[PDB]
Chain length 511, copies 3
């Protein structure tokens, strides 16, 4: 066990946590977010967290059975306005993105103003190509800060972006491009990671040879090395944006308009809508990571995955804080890079996968023991169970046993963290996600019985009892596959696909 450490109780001049100090304080608030009286909390949270063009009237409707989940349906908003414009109007020079380049010397801070201006220019480029509200746009970009401008330009005009991880092959890119039927692709000339050159345009050129709908390719000049360019079809990002004004109006989006598709391994195009997803990411960032206005949030994932979607771009920028976009690897130049980064920028949270937490602990304690790491308050794990040898090391060499460790469990289809400790309220057990997040009423069902095994010291499949705002709404042009995979196996429930157990202490353990 490990109760909330000094940095998560207001001591040493730190911000006091939003939920604290004990489990009773967490349960008091979470109880407001589930059950038949939880609309009130969700309605206020919706109106306090997001800027709306038109208010909503209904909080929620629909359910798992037919896949017609609705949240704040009559409201209209825009994700770019909430992640850029509204913070730009309040503090234009605040840093939105810490761009940590592959080479450390090339890093620099990108203000909300600069990010909004680039987003507006790209939005104007997409409009000049004929991209309309509801069209899909594919994005094949590595971890340069302009990836955020690419996402938010699509959201700004109501286009649906579909991000394709920049390590995917020509065939995997082709499949995802063809499935979403985008007519525009946004990519780079080359990607730079761990000191090597990704030939992204070369992969794009070979992929597009079997992509008959793509008519326009916008190419970011990331390296300037000679890459092939197809006349008419291919245009340079900087040359196109130079022609455009640095402001663009926001399309007024219905709450349930699709915000993006994310193909997850045939590739299944997981579709998230606008307000519910945006709310879930902003509330999870705030409470699960205890974000405060001046925080510098360092999520080391990739924007090609949902972790990059929710916890690099949408979550942090919606909260108006600073977010890191890390271009390199955990061990380039040396295995100390994560900590070189943490002290150089004074990151207040770090968020990473157990895979990397174990490629660092394997590289030796010499790379972490002589750093400050004092700016960190919360350390986060995501993607896979953290072995108890990894949990203790991340607490020791990364937190100096003074940061809370949040084991966050979720999936692409949940949009936002489902079960995790709130670091100022929950005492952690290594390898446990502990209690479920606001809006997540989870239970355990016996697969041999189809019956929920109530109580403690139980084990079975993990399910959810009621829809939550950030839940994925469909699988793109394959709603049947959406109902069969998540909704058919346990009627009245959502089926995560993961086994789980709840021990005597009520703590959840994800198998």
């Amino acid at each position: 066990l490990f109760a909330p450490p000094p940095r998560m109780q207001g001591k040493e001049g730190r911000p006091k946590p939003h939920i604290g100090p004990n489990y009773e304080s967490y349960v008091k608030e979470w109880a407001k977010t589930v059950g038949p009286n939880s609309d009130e909390w969700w309605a206020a949270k919706a109106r306090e967290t997001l800027d709306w063009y038109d208010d909503f009237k209904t909080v929620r409707a629909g359910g798992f059975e037919h896949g017609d989940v609705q949240w704040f349906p009559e409201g209209t908003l825009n994700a770019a306005y909430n992640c850029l414009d509204r913070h730009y109007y309040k503090n234009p020079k605040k840093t939105a993105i810490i761009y940590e380049a592959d080479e450390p010397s090339e890093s620099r801070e990108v203000s909300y103003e600069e990010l909004m201006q680039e987003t507006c220019r790209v939005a104007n480029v997409l409009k000049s190509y004929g991209v309309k509200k509801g069209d899909a746009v594919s994005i094949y970009l590595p971890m340069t800060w302009q990836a955020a401008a690419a996402f938010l330009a699509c959201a700004r005009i109501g286009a649906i972006h579909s991000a394709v991880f920049a390590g995917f092959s020509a065939e995997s890119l082709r499949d995802r491009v063809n499935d979403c039927e985008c007519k525009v692709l946004i990519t780079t000339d080359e990607g730079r990671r761990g000191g090597k050159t990704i030939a992204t345009k070369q992969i794009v050129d070979a992929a597009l040879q079997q992509c008959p709908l793509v008519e326009n390719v916008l190419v970011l000049r990331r390296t300037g090395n000679k890459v092939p360019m197809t006349e008419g079809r291919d245009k340079w990002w900087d040359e196109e944006c130079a022609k455009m004004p640095a402001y663009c109006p926001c399309e007024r989006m219905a709450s349930e308009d699709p915000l993006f598709i994310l193909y997850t391994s045939k590739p299944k195009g997981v579709v998230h809508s606008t307000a519910g997803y945006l709310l879930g990411t902003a509330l999870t960032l705030k409470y699960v990571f205890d974000a405060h206005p001046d925080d510098r949030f360092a999520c080391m994932a990739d924007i090609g995955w949902i972790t990059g979607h929710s916890y690099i771009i949408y979550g942090p920028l919606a909260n108006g804080i600073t977010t890191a976009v890390f271009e390199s690897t955990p061990v380039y130049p040396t295995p100390s890079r994560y900590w070189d980064f943490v002290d150089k920028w004074k990151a207040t949270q770090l968020y990473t996968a157990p895979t990397a937490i174990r490629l660092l602990r394997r590289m030796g304690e010499d790379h972490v023991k002589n750093h400050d790491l004092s700016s960190l308050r919360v350390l986060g794990s995501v993607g896979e169970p953290i072995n108890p040898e990894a949990w203790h090391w991340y607490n020791d060499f990364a937190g100096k046993n003074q940061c809370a460790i949040v084991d966050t469990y979720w999936m692409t289809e949940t949009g936002s963290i489902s079960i995790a400790p709130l670091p100022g309220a929950i005492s952690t057990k290594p390898g446990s996600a502990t209690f479920p997040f606001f809006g997540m009423d989870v239970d355990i069902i016996d697969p041999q019985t189809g019956q929920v095994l109530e109580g403690n010291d139980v084990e079975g499949v993990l399910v959810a009892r009621r829809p939550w705002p950030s839940i994925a709404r469909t699988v793109y042009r394959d709603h049947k596959r959406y109902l069969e995979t998540y909704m058919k196996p346990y009627p009245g429930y959502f089926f995560f696909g993961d086994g789980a157990a709840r021990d005597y202490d009520g703590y959840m353990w994800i198998k």
Copy 2:
């Protein structure tokens, strides 16, 4: 000394007045009427809805009745002269939101549609949840075809419940639906599909009505060979019989919808955005806009039929005509009540069908047409006399004048003398009911529409004089003084025809095209189309008044009178007469009895010069008597395909020319 006479009736005028019966007085546990309990309560509310200070009532009614995304500022503007009528123009709303979403959110399992299939066993209740989900899937299918706000979508569907989902899916996204009655020939379909220039058509494999199979998909294919703009066809699998499916163009409804999410956002529509095009009988595309039309249907449904939240409204018309647009789909669903989609005919499997339907579902109101009333009246009382039917409180009649004889049969046997009868006058171009009794307030006369609805200020003009005839006991052509919210806004891409037809004949007025009389008590009588008058020796006759006289004779089921030129009287009346099957047939003596009764009740100038006793009248598939055919046959123009049974035409030619 009254110059205006009621439609011929066998009941004395002094005993032919019908006050709201106990079921419409808040007795017997029935809901109390919204407007009651006498005429002055009608006038009291009506007076707030016309004239220089009616904006306040209409602004308030609009905001109470409909859920708006954005409020309106202006209540009304525009006018007849240039056809620029506007209502609530700055407001935005969506018709599918008002007909589905807002009721789904309140009571998702409440029944939206009683789907009464052709085969009675296959009937079932469709919840607001289920109808909304199917509406959103179809809307999502339409968007995947590139249907945008303001695009036309043709609909060629019979009376299954999915037809409501087709209408509402178009409105959900701001597309303009153009519904085509599923009984129309390939040529009529083609003409409508081309005129509206839609790129998408929604239809069935087949339809089932009265136990026969309608080969809609086959008809579609013949039409589409002459509709170059149609790219997508969405085919509902209603029967499952093998039908042709053109690769690429044609997709199955259930297969497309299975790919799509069960919710879809609503397009935020301006008040004056076109909601639909409805062709009449070149085909004239009557355009209605959104807020004023929807408000019109919701208010008339509520007040003309005294609808209350648990009512099960049984309008037996077809969504292919305005009666089904306004009083099956939009009016009843906007009010959040339960509405019937009746897939069958009134006499299938037997003429007991309406009454089986009423008691099975405890229908609270019934709304049908005089041809159906006369059709069941013909088949006798065995099929109706032994039902309860006490769930009914209001019985409606629409489409033509209802002969008093038929009115009394409706009142005696459908209503067991315990329902109010609402004779509702209106047209496709008026959007909603223009003149009718409010059934908790108005004392009814058989054959009279009585008094104008909220927002309708109607007068009678002497057509020779062009001036309004002030007062009572007057006769002329019906006109409306000011625009009302649900009036048609244009004729599709033919605004000149719209102004020339309704707005030019009497400037400052809307011209209905009907002759009308207001009697001594102020009751309005719709007598017929202006174009259909018979002039005999200077006496102008409506067909309805002579036909009402003929049906007072025992054994008569239905008649159609026509005028024919005459050298000494200008025209003469000719009558085609239909008898109940039970009547014992001699023919020459019955015909003389019929002519004598017309001369006694109207005058010798109305007496048919000749009477043709036929076994059936020529009727279209939609049920109307084919009067032009009868006229042209009497006129010697026998050699000059809407006919439901063409063998009848030869039978009529034989009896006239043989």
Copy 3:
């Protein structure tokens, strides 16, 4: 004593200050000024509109002046450096609603347009009802061609009242209109049509201007042979004479409109959606883009305050909708205010040079707005055309387009105004959207040739082009800059934002650069001296075109002049003058040599000895654009040797 001099004038400076006359004082039954009665009343209101606390006033004026569908939250944002200017960004509205619907709802029979046809008898009044219905019909026609929000639509229409309907039909549905002056060549039309990539073009069969025919449809057909994207052409039947019509592509306005309803909904536009592109004529055609709310607010406010417009005024701007002046002060400005605006189809000299004054007395115009070129044309025609007219309905007379010489200014004040009108010399540009510097007629005492003081929201300064630094205080001369964005500034150059930044934002970083020379005199009055590019540096003495031309016109029988610089080895540059004499002048009686001597002598007395021209050319007319601006770049290169009025000038040179 003063380093900055007024433009040379025959009147002594101490009698040359003109307080608001009684028509502008609320006497004789005239409306009381919105701002008055003196300089301090102007300053008191103007201080609310600039500086770090001016949001409150702009938010109030925006909500009071325009009808909004959605309110805004942010008043202003962005700046010159990147060209991301935003005003009222979250608000939504529609320009057609604001110029038509809301006035139609209140008083439908009020006259929106006084249509003054080429022939005076063919003129008539167009109600707000009639104009709204024609706008809605055309908007419905455009929607039937598939025009969507954000599409561009070219307009090649002469000055008939339907030009306003075509602009507003585009605004009504959110299309971006691109108007092209109806006299432009086919090659000029082609370039503008292709640049904006429109698929629809609105035009006439023919235009009528001064009894001459404008083969608009013939010119169009030539242009469209090289315009591949244009699919639909809507042809107004202005004359009904036989013009070619291409089957399918071309349709008749009246036949299309007759099929359409006479109401059409308004598209809900964001504040910063583009309203129109307007191409200007030193390089390629520059497509200046204005957005919706700020531009409309600016034209509405300037119309109200610079011309002191009141609800029943009959505003007579004599420009052409092909230029920004007609955009701002014929259509959008006056119709947003709900008043009556004039659409004048003729020329100032058709039928007689009394047309303007015939027009003014026929309609009882309350304000007149025209250009110095027209003023100096009527001047040379003689005063009998104006002398025996009433003209008393007038309260404000305005001048736009170029520096107005004091000689022209007094002729305007004495004859057009009978010394009872305020003269408002209005300085601005296509790129400013609306009037930038002008007298407020109920408050400001005018000097002949001074624009006087900045408008609400305009915070201007003078920079020394030789140092890049602002000149502090009064009695200074340099180049005019603005310190902050204003609501109606142009947002970009269409698909060429880099040219927008390089031209306006980069010359003096931190400021907006107008490209004009200017001086702020000892009283704080601003004087616009000419274009920076037209300045002539004679041995260090920087001479502006306006002051030398204003000197030359003080000579008897001089009608109009242009001076340009060319390099001379001794003085670096020397002044070269092209002079136009009134047509009655006897060129044989006066040897041109003695004319030159008296002219060069007259220049030395008002400006200085360095300012005399090195050579004077007598010409019959000067090279001018279709707008009327003198094409001094042509004269400068022709004088520099580098080669129909141009062939006459080159031969004479």
